[PDB]
């Protein structure tokens, strides 16, 4: 199995991990901050997804330094993962296009 496929495969795994970990850590970091809503795990996971995909609807978000730091890591991993998938696809199309040209 080529690397772009294997990497794309890994990116997925790590992303899911980042989501779970970021969910856990967001709660740990936000409880204790008056008025924070990112304090229960189920909605904390939803928040992590909507952040990683960059949808960010605005229903939930961190107010503390650490919550925002955790948030950045989720953002980055999310943009990179989906972005790496794009890389793999391009690589996939390139290879086959070369073949289609007899190369």
């Amino acid at each position, epitope marked *: 199995s080529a690397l772009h496929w294997r990497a794309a495969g890994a990116a997925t795994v790590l992303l899911v991990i980042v989501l779970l970990a970021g969910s*856990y850590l967001a*709660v*740990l970091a*936000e*409880r*204790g*901050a*008056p*008025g*924070a*809503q990112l*304090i*229960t*795990y*189920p909605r904390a996971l939803w928040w992590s997804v909507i952040t990683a995909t960059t949808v960010g609807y605005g229903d939930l978000y961190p107010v503390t330094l650490w919550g925002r730091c955790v948030a950045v890591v989720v953002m980055v991993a999310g943009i990179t993962s989906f972005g790496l998938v794009t890389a793999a696809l391009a690589t996939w199309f390139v290879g086959r296009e070369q073949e289609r040209r007899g190369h």
Partner: antibody
Amino acid sequence: QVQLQQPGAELVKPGASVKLSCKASGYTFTSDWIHWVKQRPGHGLEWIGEIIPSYGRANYNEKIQKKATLTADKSSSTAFMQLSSLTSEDSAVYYCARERGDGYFAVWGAGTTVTVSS
Amino acid sequence: DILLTQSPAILSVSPGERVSFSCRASQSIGTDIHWYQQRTNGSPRLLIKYASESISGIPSRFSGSGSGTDFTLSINSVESEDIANYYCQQSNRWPFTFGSGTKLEI
């Protein structure tokens, strides 16, 4: 079986401190939070604080005078609440509770009636 | 800090009659509300979670409803054993808070 075991009573002289416990049994998860609730005779329930055993962090009520200090023992599955420099004003029932990190108190301990007298 | 107002503080009802307790949050909180029943000398016990979700062990007689700011805990055909104090509790914003409570008198 009783998920949370709490001592029946604790007599404390004014100015002294006491350390309440809360033995936990049953299913346990890294996302569990143990809350403490004060209730004086004839009155409502007051949120005192909380702590997450898996990590060891605890938060407290900012609307009241901090008298408690929460700790946890992962090996013995026991949560402790240190109350210090108590006065009659601190005489009440202190309940411990378990929240699966989803916002509600699924189970409460029987409660420890603390009396502050000489 | 969300203020949960429970009024009236006491509710007189006749046997087998329907009753409804009220709990109003100072601000909107979706359906992040939990109801507890505490009998004389008894420890608090969860009745309804997230405004209307049932709980195992609890009688089908108990029901919940509402969203936003106004929540209601209902009981169809109240019987002697329902006598006790009732509290709502929010988990929408930190820190979690409790309503002052409503006593049920038969």
